[PDB]
Amino acid sequence: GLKAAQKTLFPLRSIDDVVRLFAAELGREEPDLVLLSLVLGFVEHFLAVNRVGLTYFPVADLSIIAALYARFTAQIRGAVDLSLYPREGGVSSRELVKKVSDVIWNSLSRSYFKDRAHIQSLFSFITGTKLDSSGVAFAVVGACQALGLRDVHLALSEDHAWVVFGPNGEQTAEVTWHGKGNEDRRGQTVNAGVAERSWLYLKGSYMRCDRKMEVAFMVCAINPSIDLHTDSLELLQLQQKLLWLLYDLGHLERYPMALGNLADLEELEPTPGRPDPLTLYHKGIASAKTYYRDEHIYPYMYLAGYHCRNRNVREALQAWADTATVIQDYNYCREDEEIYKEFFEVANDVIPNLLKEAASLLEAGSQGSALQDPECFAHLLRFYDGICKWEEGSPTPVLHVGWATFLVQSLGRFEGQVRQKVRIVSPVLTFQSEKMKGMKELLVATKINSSAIKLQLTAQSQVQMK
């Protein structure tokens, strides 16, 4: 290092002292990713993993943080001999990047639960020799910064992380694993994934971080959870304040998911004088439209969740229709299973529960119910249209008869006289999927023909012998 100027704020005795440290680092030429991740992991450990002895805030003494920092930098500098990997042009080589990745990978415990909480930070790596998937990628970038490799940066999709490096920052390399039971492609480019138009690689519209965005990533990576039923209020407040610091300095401009995280925190505990959660969700969507060709799913899912929690059924349906309008221009590939799981839960659990409560409230006399609004029926239909269009030309199918039962049920929550008011043109809606085009006639009849719907959604050829 640490440099004298980095040590002057220690000891850190409060959340605000941690915010001051981040402010100071973010004001430097290069914020120190290693320092910052160790501090966050230290504080998270003593606020979320082990709170024994806690009276206010775990004091971060310079002696403790400097020793962790020395362990990390000694481990990396000792194992990576830069003289074996000459750098032309102030840029790194694939071989060097792969070496840094191997060094991190080879340091990890042979066997542990990869999906647990609080194994994201360099604190976890040094004290537990444990990292989660994206934590390995972050640790590679931190190590490269420690080594003076200014061109190596974190690349992020909505379910994976890797690195960019090299001339013009144009090279990509895998540095960590993805999912469970996938074969690792460490060392390789991400071009085959981009070319196949999978969600995992976002058609190439993934985030290419600068150092400031990498700070934002580690802040998003804070995990306030103590257990299933309990969050650390101290860690929530710290994450919230750090995200505001980043927001004010301009560093969330290109980070849709961080804006959604901040909005969720503001919903929980609003900060006086700040934009409402809805404003922030909309800024996340604007960020994705501006910088990422509107190819991201999570900006709309964050918005839909907020409306769902607040029982704004119309607005929740509209936001989920929007999620599907993004997904329809992807191919569903092996390794996209996480987004399949989220669409499945929305279609087959969340929407049914929302419409079930809506139906009870309609029986109880509600006015302006989404169930009496044809535009809400149109959103439900656009949702299914997008999922069906996603499935077209994909190497793996999406829909099956499990989805059909819930579709029939959800359609049935709207009376015939409401469904009839939607105009399906080749309230007005156009279908992109051949499945929904063929279902059009079925969608307005007073009694929904359940078996014909099922056949059209699953493209089931035949009916029972017997």
Ligand X SMILES: COc1cc2c(cc(C#N)n2Cc2cn[nH]c2)c(C)c1CN1CCC(Nc2ncnc3sc(CC(F)(F)F)cc23)CC1
Encoded tokens for 431: 């279908």
- With CB under 6 A as the contact rule, the residue among 102, 210, 342, 375 that binds ligand X is 342
Q: Which stretch binds ligand X (CB under 6 A): 151-159, 274-282, 433-441, 449-457?
A: 151-159
One-letter amino acid for residue 41 of the chain: G
Q: Compute the distance between CA of residue 258 and CA of residue 275 in angstroms, rounded to an integer.
A: 15
Note whether 156 binds ligand X by CB under 6 A.
yes
Q: Which stretch binds ligand X (CB under 6 A): 91-99, 153-161, 232-240, 427-435?
A: 153-161
Which residue lies nearer to ligand X by CB, 81 or 115? Answer: 115
One-letter amino acid for residue 460 of the chain: Q
Question: Between residue 304 and residue 333, which ones bind ligand X under the rule CB under 6 A?
Answer: 304-305, 308
Note whether 139 binds ligand X by CB under 6 A.
no
Encoded tokens for 69: 């920092």
Which residue lies nearer to ligand X by CB, 307 or 413? Answer: 307
Which residue lies nearer to ligand X by CB, 96 or 161? Answer: 161
Which residue lies nearer to ligand X by CB, 115 or 183? Answer: 115
User: Binding marks (x or -) toward ligand X, 48..87, rule CB under 6 A?
Assistant: ----------------------------------------
Q: Compute the distance between CA of residue 221 and CA of residue 370 in angstroms, rounded to an integer.
A: 36
- With CB under 6 A as the contact rule, the residue among 243, 301, 339, 436 that binds ligand X is 301
List beta partners, residue 162: 155
Q: Compute the distance between CA of residue 20 and CA of residue 7 in angstroms, rounded to an integer.
A: 12
Q: What share of the chain is helix, strand, coil (3-state, %, to 5)?
A: 55, 5, 40
- With CB under 6 A as the contact rule, the residue among 350, 408, 442, 452 that binds ligand X is 350
Exposed/middle/buried for residue 236 (C-beta within 10 Å: 0-12, 13-18, 19+): middle
| Distances 361 to 217, 355, 358, 364, 439 between C-alpha atoms, Å | 41, 10, 5, 5, 29
Q: How far is the CB of 236 from ligand X (least distance, A)?
A: 14
Calculate the CA 313 to chain-centre distance: 23
Which residue lies nearer to ligand X by CB, 158 or 266? Answer: 158
- With CB under 6 A as the contact rule, the residue among 33, 40, 104, 161 that binds ligand X is 161
Q: Compute the distance between CA of residue 315 and CA of residue 10 in angstroms, rounded to an integer.
A: 47
Encoded tokens for 123: 């604190």
Q: Which stretch binds ligand X (CB under 6 A): 155-163, 182-190, 245-253, 289-297?
A: 155-163
Question: Between residue 209 and residue 238, which ones bind ligand X under the rule CB under 6 A?
Answer: 220
Q: Compute the distance between CA of residue 51 and CA of residue 8 in angstroms, rounded to an integer.
A: 27
List beta partners, residue 429: 424
User: Binding marks (x or -) toward ligand X, 253..292, rule CB under 6 A?
Assistant: ----xx--x-------------------------------
Q: Compute the distance between CA of residue 289 and CA of residue 292 in angstroms, rounded to an integer.
A: 6
Q: How far is the CB of 351 from ligand X (least distance, A)?
A: 10
Residues in touch with ligand X (CB under 6 A): 134, 156-161, 220, 257-258, 261, 298, 301-302, 304-305, 308, 342, 345-346, 350
